[PDB]
Design a protein around this ligand. Sequence first.
Ligand SMILES: CCOC(=O)[C@H](C)NC(=O)[C@H](CC(C)C)NC(=O)[C@@H](CC(=O)NO)CC(C)C
Ligand SMILES: [Ca+2]
Ligand SMILES: [Ca+2]
Ligand SMILES: [Sm+3]
Ligand SMILES: [Zn+2]
Ligand SMILES: [Zn+2]
Length: 163
Amino acid sequence: LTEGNPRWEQTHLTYRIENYTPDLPRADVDHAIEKAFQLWSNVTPLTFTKVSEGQADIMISFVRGDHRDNSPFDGPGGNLAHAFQPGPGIGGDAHFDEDERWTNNFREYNLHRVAAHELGHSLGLSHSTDIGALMYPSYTFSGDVQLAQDDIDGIQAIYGRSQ
Ligand SMILES: CCOC(=O)[C@H](C)NC(=O)[C@H](CC(C)C)NC(=O)[C@@H](CC(=O)NO)CC(C)C
Ligand SMILES: [Ca+2]
Ligand SMILES: [Ca+2]
Ligand SMILES: [Sm+3]
Ligand SMILES: [Zn+2]
Ligand SMILES: [Zn+2]
């Protein structure tokens, strides 16, 4: 028990995509989520393994409206997605608003870009004030999805560096 955010004490985590969005072909959803994990994996000693059945540290799903938690979704626009901080059960899980039009290109809203942000929460990060950072509280799409120095510093402060 220390201060700051809750973190995972395990370094090898598993994730599972519970349901898929009909907005994109299955392969593009898998790619977007795998690439998002890779970003954070590149700068820390964390590893992620995808499971098809059973429980996993990070469960991912596409839902709309009221979905059994205290923050029901709001239809197109507004809130795009949310995630829980590390911990048992629902901890680390990420929920994406299905009422949004998810994309695999530059048009709103790029799944990969939003997933990268949500997984940061799943790993224990809070928001950044840097408008160039992935953890910024609002959606921005620059044309590429990469960690800003602010994102790299924040995740390394918790789990350390890689190599
Ligand atoms: C430019 C502003 O409006 C927009 O472009 C779109 C419509 N909405 C948003 O960007 C809203 C903004 C809030 C002010 C409602 N933010 C989010 O949905 C965050 C929620 C979060 O923190 N999840 O972890 C998710 C990430 C994609 C940043
Ligand atoms: Ca969990
Ligand atoms: Ca919404
Ligand atoms: Sm949709
Ligand atoms: Zn939710
Ligand atoms: Zn956020």
